[PDB]
Design a protein around this ligand. Structure first.
Ligand SMILES: Nc1nc2c(ncn2[C@@H]2O[C@H](COP(=O)(O)CP(=O)(O)OP(=O)(O)O)[C@@H](O)[C@H]2O)c(=O)[nH]1
Ligand SMILES: Nc1nc2c(ncn2[C@@H]2O[C@H](COP(=O)(O)OP(=O)(O)OP(=O)(O)O)[C@@H](O)[C@H]2O)c(=O)[nH]1
Ligand SMILES: Nc1nc2c(ncn2[C@@H]2O[C@H](COP(=O)(O)OP(=O)(O)OP(=O)(O)O)[C@@H](O)[C@H]2O)c(=O)[nH]1
Ligand SMILES: [Mg+2]
Ligand SMILES: [Mg+2]
Ligand SMILES: [Mg+2]
Lengths: 423, 429, 423
């Protein structure tokens, strides 16, 4: 009766969704053919025959990666009216994804939403797997979110996004993407989510015993996070926290909606022993700086709000002693005027494995993330100091002052976390 | 979709394409006839971009062969991969440009251009979606100088959005095979700086060097001289023709690299390179493919990156590979050669990883470089121009075709406008 | 409920620990796989599954001897987050272990302590198996002990160390190690322990019938001592003496904390007969000078305090007559103003064998050990009279006067035992 649809924008989001719906089919026992040999209306719908289809929309301006789903192993799962392709990519040009090509096939993707919104009645959240690296994953992202608040307005819109890395940075105009996309995702998205590529590597290198990771394995870490956020809807625990509450819990002021995800425990197969993984043991590893997936030191700021989504085998009194430890420390410290800073969620379902006992997803809306914007503002100034690459965005119809209008917009964003940090 | 139309010219550039389409033949399992014999079905999924699938199990090279004398067209059609082409597309003159730019651009350039611009139109109409046009020619001869440069100005009048790349050989630094190589460079410089989106620039002498330094060859033929550019051109679009862990195409390479439209003159780079037997005694992995690129000797344009400053860096890999083995190597090498780069770009290394190797070795990489080292070659070329111009020699040919000094002078000034702008960002930091 | 963790510093301590935890697994029936087919929380902890792990931390700056554990027979016993290796050794340079390399991986080893200190609640002592011979076993030893009194301060810190031999001496700058390490282990260690290599040989030669010993067999003698010191915690005797009492019993003044270990009876297999090994028979063999493991004649000074840790089969009245003999002799004599100079400990557990009825560990804080320092001060003067090897410690960042500051520090140490000896 309760639903939560998903949209995938750009090439980086599709390869996230290739591992996500790989995991969801293994959750409810679904085959790649939509077949299984109760309450799962959030991510699936039933046909007239005994087949289930995903509530997913795959958009791309280049026809490459969607053919990898249209010819891959997960081929028969998807409705061919969902698989939407373009012809010419934005090709790491935000003005092409926002003005040139994305304005043409915008009619088809938005029409597929209401075709999914017929059978949905408990519409409780949206999923937009979009990166800020590629132009298609960013230029279409701004055009998509404008119509939905015109469409729904009151319904929830969540973005499990990918943060551009401060050191290991692939493309060139990746600093140009973030400042331009700021005005959309601060005025439409109810709670955006930042994940950096860079912190994943040492988790793969040290904690997962494989120094040289693959992008197939980078998606496996985030796919476990997205499932355990939905662990209250898809199942039944003693304390089920639905997605309406998170945007009401984690948001003290309606502009501040940038937490970070933290999955724990992250172990290897050989290190599955030499440990016991009690509920007090693993939550201290959550607040370890080298276990999070965002390159931000949590002891460089203060926590505004914290959330903990447990699964597996959990007794709350045993967690009650675990939370009592973290308030009674000193290197871990909160925003002082928020003394009630925990949101606990327990599900009695084990964390499934993709080819352990319990697992924790930590969601901490903190002030440690605010330094990451300043590391990216420093990138954007010098490339705009030369007026470099202006003839591509202006070459694809964009105002020069539209950079400058969004330039001060980050300063009003940055002064928020500075103001909340002091008493 | 996003098909690509191929145009040739000159006499050097045809023999390169006479080897380049042999490279594309075995990168798609294409026989010398025109049929198909490959086994990997990733070839047929994107076969259309360089080939029209003709009627009845056929595949024809979507290419336009242009000469001005029937000799080189006879040599292609008689040797290998000559019957694979369409006989309708052997569009060639009868005179020969006489190693004159003005003959290829004014008198004899106006004749065969109408026969070409329908064939360009017939392919561009037949293509479902069009990506861009590519040209392989000379800058030293007559047909490669005038005839190719006359086409591109007519194409910019046609298509504003379609990309354009010329794999034009730079006139030679020290050896003088062409007597009038400034007069085929400088009059060709003005066409390239106006309306070519990206422009590939290869010195002759470094191609002799790379075939002699790393490989240690004794009798290098043009089948092995010009073969290195043939693998180079294939590595530019190898992320288009096949899926990857990080795909790329000709528009992604353009907007990432070119910082301002007057600075788009690039340099290649290819790895790995061994001998016939000295091929296993080396850890041919990502860090070996890392440090093989960034040295001065791997550049097919003879220029020292130590005597200059980069602006942007692209890198296209081939074959299956990991990422932190690549990414840290693609990050740390910016710090050891720290002062050689420029200040105002953070992380100027563009990475591109396909998932299909060449038919051969397991992993391969294609380097696309941009630096301020190339403008120091033009000061030699501007000196080579003015040495034959301060006496005003060789003018009566161009006077016989009809041209003032100002067209020579402003193009030399526009050559100096290239000098005044690659020096400008080099002086800045 | 009561715990006692262990740390191994340097190459010589690891080969001690290779035989120690070999013995502990044979005590409680533990396999090398942490498996056994009650109260043993002192040296072990239980996983979620039925496996037990040792409370041991192995540090080394060279990767050699730790690979001998990472590939040896005792491989699966150890948590791979405990096995800590370096890259470049101190290589018999104390200034490298104290300044150069040991300052880098100091963060990892200290972080492993609090990860062990979670499950510990009755933290009653530390074990640091460090030699004074190698630079890594001495240079890391000073850096390690400074943080722990900042960490705990009140908790017990014990060092089962190896004394450098006065005649059979391997390296060259071994006199330089002892004077530099003096200021740390006299200001941090609650009770250090000296064991010489030289007295072990004649015990192996005469009393053990093998004239040519191996370093595998040298570790077997000390490993029996360390177990019987813990014989009150790990088991139940009628008089269990815990490790809090020893540092309160054996220490009359808080600087004097240097007793010596004495294991007895030390017999061979063929000499297991022709004897009866009563409790009065073997304790006279304890005070025999050729049965102790420190090259110091006990009839060259006076005893300040004595301790006796019995195990096997012991009746205290039968020991009461045995102790009454030793006070009623003349060649054995005490410090006279300490007339209550015995600490007795009985455990009803037999001394286990590694591939008899009763066993005695004797701990005698005496003034006979004070001549061993003077034998080593005589080595240190002449090598410093030439100013030899100054360009390595100063070559690795050390003050010349830091030798001279520690030079008079041994004189204040030496005048302690001289002052307590007279009435
Ligand atoms: N790397 C190569 N350079 C070549 C080759 N053939 C010629 N050249 C160079 O190209 C220049 C001559 O240009 P072309 O071969 O294209 C002569 P083209 O048909 O363009 O015009 P004409 O002078 O009217 O014959 C000159 O600098 C030669 O050194 C070749 O196979 N490889
Ligand atoms: N989460 C995730 N991000 C990835 C992965 N591979 C690449 N990325 C990121 O995606 C960025 C590029 O974005 P893409 O989605 O591939 O490109 P696009 O949105 O289609 O836009 P264009 O292709 O330029 O038109 C890279 O710079 C990386 O930061 C992956 O497997 N997972
Ligand atoms: N107790 C004991 N001591 C030993 C043994 N083998 C050697 N030693 C002593 O260890 C001393 C050398 O110390 P090491 O621990 O090996 O060296 P290190 O501290 O790792 O420092 P390096 O100089 O880098 O090797 C020798 O001089 C011996 O006195 C053994 O089996 N048992
Ligand atoms: Mg893309
Ligand atoms: Mg020619
Ligand atoms: Mg050693």
């Amino acid at each position: 009766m309760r639903e939560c649809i998903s949209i995938h924008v750009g090439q980086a989001g599709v390869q996230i969704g290739n591992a996500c719906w790989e995991l969801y089919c293994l959750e409810h026992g679904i085959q790649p053919d939509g077949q299984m040999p109760d309450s799962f209306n959030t991510f699936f719908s039933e046909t007239g025959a005994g087949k289930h289809v995903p509530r997913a929309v795959f958009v791309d301006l280049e026809p490459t990666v969607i053919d990898e789903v249209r010819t891959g192993t997960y081929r028969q799962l998807f409705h061919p009216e969902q698989l939407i392709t373009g012809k010419e990519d934005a090709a790491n040009n935000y003005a092409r994804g926002h003005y040139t090509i994305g304005k043409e096939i915008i009619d088809l993707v938005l029409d597929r939403i209401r075709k999914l919104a017929d059978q949905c009645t408990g519409l409780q959240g949206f999923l937009v797997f979009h990166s800020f690296g590629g132009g298609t994953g960013s230029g279409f992202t701004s055009l998509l979110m404008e119509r939905l608040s015109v469409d729904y307005g009151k319904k929830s819109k969540l973005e499990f996004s990918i943060y551009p890395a401060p050191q290991v940075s692939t493309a060139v105009v990746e600093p140009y993407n973030s400042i331009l996309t700021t005005h959309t995702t601060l005025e439409h998205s109810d709670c955006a989510f930042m994940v950096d590529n860079e912190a994943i590597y040492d988790i793969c290198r040290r904690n997962l015993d494989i120094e040289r990771p693959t992008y197939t394995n980078l998606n496996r870490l985030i796919s476990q996070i997205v499932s355990s956020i939905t662990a209250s809807l898809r199942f039944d625990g003693a304390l089920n926290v639905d997605l309406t509450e998170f945007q009401t819990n984690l948001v003290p002021y309606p502009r501040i909606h940038f937490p970070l995800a933290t999955y724990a425990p992250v172990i290897s197969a050989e290190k599955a022993y030499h440990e016991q993984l009690s509920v007090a043991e693993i939550t201290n590893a959550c607040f370890e700086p080298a276990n999070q997936m965002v390159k931000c030191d949590p002891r460089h700021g203060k926590y505004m709000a914290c959330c903990l989504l447990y699964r597996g085998d959990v007794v709350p009194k045993d967690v009650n002693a675990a939370i009592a430890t973290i308030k009674t420390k000193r290197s871990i410290q909160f925003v002082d005027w928020c003394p009630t800073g925990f949101k606990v969620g327990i599900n009695y379902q084990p964390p499934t494995v993709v080819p352990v006992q319990r697992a924790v997803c930590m969601l901490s809306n903190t002030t440690a993330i605010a330094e990451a914007w300043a590391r990216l503002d420093h990138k954007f100034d010098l490339m705009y100091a030369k007026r470099a690459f202006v003839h591509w965005y202006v070459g694809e119809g964009m105002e020069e002052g539209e950079f400058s209008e969004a330039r001060e917009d980050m300063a009003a964003l940055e002064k928020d976390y500075e103001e909340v940090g002091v008493d | 979709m996003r098909e690509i139309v191929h145009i040739q010219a000159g006499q050097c550039g045809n023999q390169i394409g006479a080897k380049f389409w042999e490279v594309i033949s075995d990168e798609h399992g294409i026989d010398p006839t025109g049929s198909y014999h490959g086994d990997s079905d990733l070839q047929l999924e994107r076969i259309n971009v360089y080939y029209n699938e003709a009627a009845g199990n056929k595949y024809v090279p979507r290419a336009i062969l242009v000469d001005l004398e029937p000799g080189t067209m006879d040599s292609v059609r008689s040797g290998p991969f000559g019957q694979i082409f369409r006989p309708d597309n052997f569009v060639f003159g009868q005179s020969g440009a006489g190693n004159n730019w003005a003959k290829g651009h004014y008198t004899e350039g106006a004749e065969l251009v109408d026969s070409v611009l329908d064939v360009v139109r017939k392919e561009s109409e037949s293509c479902d979606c069009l990506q861009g046009f590519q040209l392989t020619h000379s800058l030293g001869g007559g047909t490669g100088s005038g005839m190719g440069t006359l086409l591109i100005s007519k194409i910019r009048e046609e298509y504003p959005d379609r990309i354009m790349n010329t794999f034009s050989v730079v006139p030679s630094p020290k050896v003088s095979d062409t007597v009038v190589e400034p007069y085929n460079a400088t009059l060709s410089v003005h066409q390239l700086v106006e309306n070519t989106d990206e422009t590939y620039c290869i010195d002759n002498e470094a191609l002799y060097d790379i075939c002699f330094r790393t490989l240690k060859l004794t009798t290098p033929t043009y089948g092995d001289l010009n073969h290195l550019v043939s693998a180079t051109m294939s590595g530019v679009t190898t992320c288009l023709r096949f899926p990857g862990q990080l795909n790329a195409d000709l528009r992604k390479l353009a907007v990432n690299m070119v910082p301002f439209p007057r600075l788009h003159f690039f340099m290649p780079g290819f790895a790995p390179l061994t001998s016939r037997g000295s091929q296993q005694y080396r850890a041919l992995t990502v860090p070996e493919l890392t440090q093989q690129m960034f040295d001065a000797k791997n550049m097919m344009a003879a220029c020292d990156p130590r005597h200059g400053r980069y602006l942007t860096v692209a890198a296209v890999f081939r074959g299956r590979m990991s990422m932190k083995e690549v990414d840290e190597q693609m990050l740390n090498v910016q710090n050891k050669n720290s002062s050689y780069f420029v200040e105002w770009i953070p992380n100027n290394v563009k990475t591109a990883v396909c998932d299909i190797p060449p038919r051969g070795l397991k992993m391969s990489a294609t380097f696309i470089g941009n630096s301020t080292a190339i403008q120091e070659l033009f000061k030699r070329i501007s000196e080579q121009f003015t040495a034959m111009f301060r006496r005003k020699a060789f003018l009566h040919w161009y006077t016989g075709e009809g041209m003032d000094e100002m067209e020579f002078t402003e193009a030399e000034s526009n050559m100096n406008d290239l000098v005044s702008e690659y020096q400008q960002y080099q002086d800045a930091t």
